[PDB]
Amino acid sequence: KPIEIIGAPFSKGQPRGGVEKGPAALRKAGLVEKLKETEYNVRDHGDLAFVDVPNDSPFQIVKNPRSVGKANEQLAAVVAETQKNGTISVVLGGDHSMAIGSISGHARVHPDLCVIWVDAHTDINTPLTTSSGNLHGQPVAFLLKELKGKFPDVPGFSWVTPCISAKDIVYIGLRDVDPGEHYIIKTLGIKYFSMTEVDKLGIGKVMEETFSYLLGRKKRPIHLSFCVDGLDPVFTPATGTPVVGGLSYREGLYITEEIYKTGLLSGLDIMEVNPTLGKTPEEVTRTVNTAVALTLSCFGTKREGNHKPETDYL
Amino acid sequence: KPIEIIGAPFSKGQPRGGVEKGPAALRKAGLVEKLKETEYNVRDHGDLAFVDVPNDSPFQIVKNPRSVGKANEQLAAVVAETQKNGTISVVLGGDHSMAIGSISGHARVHPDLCVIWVDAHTDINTPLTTSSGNLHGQPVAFLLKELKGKFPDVPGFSWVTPCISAKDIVYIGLRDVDPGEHYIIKTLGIKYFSMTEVDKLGIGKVMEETFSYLLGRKKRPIHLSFCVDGLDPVFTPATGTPVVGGLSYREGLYITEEIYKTGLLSGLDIMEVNPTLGKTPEEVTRTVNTAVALTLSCFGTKREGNHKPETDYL
Amino acid sequence: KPIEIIGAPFSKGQPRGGVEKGPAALRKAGLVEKLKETEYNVRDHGDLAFVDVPNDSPFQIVKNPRSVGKANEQLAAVVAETQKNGTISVVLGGDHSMAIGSISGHARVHPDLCVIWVDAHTDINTPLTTSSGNLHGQPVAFLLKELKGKFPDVPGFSWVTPCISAKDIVYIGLRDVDPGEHYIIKTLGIKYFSMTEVDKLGIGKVMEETFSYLLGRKKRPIHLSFCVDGLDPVFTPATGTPVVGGLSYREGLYITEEIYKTGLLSGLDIMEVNPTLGKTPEEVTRTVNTAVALTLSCFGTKREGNHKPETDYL
Ligand SMILES: [Mn+2]
Ligand SMILES: [Mn+2]
Ligand SMILES: [Mn+2]
Ligand SMILES: [Mn+2]
Ligand SMILES: [Mn+2]
Ligand SMILES: [Mn+2]
């Protein structure tokens, strides 16, 4: 089965430059070559060139609305292109705002898709709830169907159409929620397993339930959106919004391991990896190895080990 | 419901000076104002002046017995006073030996109360079993009813009256216990979950069984004494007696979260946070930041998030 | 209940020097003295003088076959001697390749013994499957009954007799396995708990299932081989092949505590602790402290604490 790497060197999703350097870091560490070693076929799409919109005046509080809006539209145009030819889409980003390109492009070809959002935030505010005009923490808002019309239209997001409903997605690793956000998720009653939950049940029971909830009834493709800030700052320090007491290195692979196991992974997002934010070359090396590591896990590489079929090693 | 912050800048309890700075370290970090942000009312009682006793000769091994006694007596006098006006007490200490006063004053108004001791030690040595005349490691030996008269009367501790029995207390996070201490808890049969127990059951099940143990039969107030050294040093640096293999930030959080949920916490202790014992300013910020995290957990703040009632954020 | 420490300062098991200094590291940290504080009797059998074989040409890929084979032959003979007199055999190593002598000496006197292999690796390659001629990562290949005659006879290992079968052994914390290795364990179907396992069950249930799998039917002596690298480097950094995402200082103790709990320990190995590889004295002090923390545990020392029998501390 096909795999297509699509770099998204973008960052206007937030105030700290540097995340457009993620792709270049991930590829540098050896992601593309490490993947060709798996049972899959790998075609690297290269890095998309994001045209900058001049005079991108702020829509109320939101910053860079036409820029962010334009990039994502170019992303969702690319994604549909690989998913159309039946090939799994791995997007190497920038900030999370690129999810709107990532998941909108996915749904065009697999409208019945679900989403597992591994993040420490819901990154799902509305241009009416953000205390910051930053769109990297609003990706979901623009996606949700039940959120259509619950906030103004934002210059550059006309092309967007709510693709998934509050029933088809599940958060994992939440720990920093704004009053606003907590409201929405409760009100719309979305399924999540916040830090608290993943203390009480354990990452073992948590993927068991998230699977019966999303795949309990019908079998449908999986779109995994992984904010490196999902695991703790001791495993991913090179991120813009780090937050204490997160998901261990282990539960992370566990996650990515089980998702492989479903044979249902359709879209994968490796967002917000920032090489310039590492306090030491180590932490940058740390954040990337564990970013690559999770990316190889969603594609077979197990911790008990692997071996090539039909090969008698004796 | 009322909350009353009581400043206990005491340290005589032990040899390492620096703990009487705890309050000033927790207040500085924003504890007081952080709390008024919750659904509760907050009145800061201020820091109690502790009269020093001249010529506080040592009773055999014990050190500063009269000094440590009078303070506590003035602590139970302040506590009992605010609990009388139906308000929850949060004591920012010093060394733990002040618990003596926080639990003694508490029981005068709620004599049927229980105690969830989260710490790395049992601080239950008798003036006869301590290898150090230190009182921060004995607060319990004085409170226990089954321990009345199993050791000599210590000058300054005549006013004390064992308010609780070996039945109404459970320990959490035990890992450093002295031969004498383990004996006592085995003999009197106290309910505990030593780190070994938390690895076995999970911080999930553990809180499930400690609740049905202390609250399976009758519903009573919860006095929560928390020795910062309760968690591992990696999280709680700036503590006098740090001991490897401790309770994570997450577990110490899941505990406090659940103590809220009961709606039964009555008295709270935030003991042994030492500012001067931090190897770097970071480590002083850290322990503090997470001593605060917990204090704001005991009162609502959830990781999944919080939103104000009756407010429609849409 | 006899204990016999046996220093095996060997290292030819791999390319990095330093491991021979292990014993002389554990010993300084005060291992022997600390053990005498337990309920056991202690006899330190000094360190073994290992004669170096001149002109130890490489058998195909394998390196130091004759020097490694001779050393172990001399270890096994020391071992089988103190097990003979009814004493427990604790071996402070070098490189793990000395397991071969440690477990070989052990099966002579207790041919019905079991082994719990706590290590980040399976150390079970064959001279035909190694990518390196390193014997520290093959010990098991020489011990297995099912592996007899699955490779060529290696110079110096003519004295070795497969003593345990695929059935009496179990791994714990595997997270780095080469293609070959995985195959083997799969094919001979060995009972293990990779890191994924420990995540999904917990160090609680894990020991429950390893005990009922190894001791469910008959009660037999337990040989515990502990590759310090089985833990996470943050706990055991001073090691030759560290690997991210290991067991916690807490599971590590949990494990050694339950093994004490059976009353069946018989043989114990504390291999591959290398003092020269700690980036800082601290990492050397750390690692060491826990190759002992763990040992003094296999002999009782409980985190809940201990107290001497018949001694009324009141
Ligand atoms: Mn995000
Ligand atoms: Mn995030
Ligand atoms: Mn303590
Ligand atoms: Mn204490
Ligand atoms: Mn190993
Ligand atoms: Mn090994």
Short mmCIF file of C-alpha atoms and ligand atoms in Angstrom, two decimals, chain A residues 96 117-123 136-137 227 229-230 239 241 272, ligand 2:
data_model
loop_
_atom_site.label_atom_id
_atom_site.label_comp_id
_atom_site.label_asym_id
_atom_site.label_seq_id
_atom_site.Cartn_x
_atom_site.Cartn_y
_atom_site.Cartn_z
CA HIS A 96 -1.52 22.65 13.43
CA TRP A 117 -6.69 14.03 17.74
CA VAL A 118 -3.64 13.52 19.87
CA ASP A 119 -2.91 16.89 21.34
CA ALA A 120 -2.72 18.60 24.73
CA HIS A 121 -5.15 21.18 23.48
CA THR A 122 -8.41 20.89 21.65
CA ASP A 123 -7.00 23.50 19.19
CA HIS A 136 -3.24 26.85 14.95
CA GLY A 137 -5.51 26.27 17.95
CA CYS A 227 0.54 17.55 17.86
CA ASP A 229 3.06 18.77 22.16
CA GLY A 230 0.82 15.81 22.92
CA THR A 239 7.38 22.63 20.41
CA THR A 241 3.12 25.25 23.36
CA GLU A 272 4.11 21.66 15.13
MN MN D 2 -1.53 21.75 20.77
#
